[PDB]
DNA sequence: GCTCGGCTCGGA
DNA sequence: CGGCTCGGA
């Protein structure tokens, strides 16, 4: 079970959000090489500003583990987390975040800002990028009607 | 057409903050107002629901999106009893609200001018105004007994 | 109709 | 009660 193996599962959930006319982003929560949470974007269909892929995966992980704090967990998302999504990882105290393509415009994981690696914060989450970034950019490109070169 | 003040809506957010205090949670309350009309209510429910996103401001934003049938809430004002965190402040940018009114400041991990300022960060698509110091004396009394701290920290 | 506008939902 | 803004604050 490599990072690309778990990313292939997150890409499957991202296709479900694409069929629901949402942002094609998928997220899966892994703890000790096992899935504990799944999530995909459902903001437009559910009228929820927090119905992102990573939030729904974090919401599901807290229910199965019966604890809103998920220590030493690794989340596999297809997009760079936003300020809202990155803030939930600090509250969940997860271990590592693996995203594919970077949001060079409003990214909160080292692009526009870096809240996951802030010194004044109480928790530090490691970041790993470039995992299956070719297949993650192809979905977001057709959604925003953008070329694959901006990624 | 009646216009209420910031302290009037803050007194309602203090009522919801007592509900989170009774649920053994962080005594924080939040209420969403649009054109002097309540569209969302929220208090901390992270421990009871096992939800890392069950904060006071998030649950109030989830209620506003359901009543308005739109995850974007323009020209809306949120009345919270605590300084919003990085997660809550990021949700306000996604909801495109107009103004956030909080009571006491989180001098440690505040995201509304303390540790960071994401509502007034350059390069973002939306800018939300912040109003502070509204009924901060009564908001600190609830969080003080929760964290077992004196009133001199806030 | 002649691959929408300007670009990381349509207040991107 | 510990030590500070849940108990890994
Ligand atoms: Zn996000
Ligand atoms: Zn918060």
Numbering used by the authors:
A (entry chain A): 6 to 156
B (entry chain B): 3 to 156
Per the authors:
To illuminate how amino acid substitutions identified from directed evolution affect TADAC’s substrate tolerance, we determined crystal structures of TadA*8.20 from ABE8.20-m13, the template used to evolve CABE-T1, and TADAC-1 variants from CABE-T1 reported here. Through X-ray crystallography, we show how the accumulation of substitutions impacts the shape of the active site cavity and may contribute to the accommodation of cytosine as substrate and the subsequent shift in specificity toward C-to-U deamination.
Crystal structures of TadA*8.20 and TADAC-1.17 were determined in a complex with ssDNA substrate containing the adenine transition-state analog 2-deoxy-8-azanebularine (d8Az). These two structures are highly similar, and the four TADAC-1.17 substitutions (T17A, A48G, S82T and A142E) derived from evolution do not drastically alter substrate tolerance by changing the protein structure or the ssDNA binding mode.
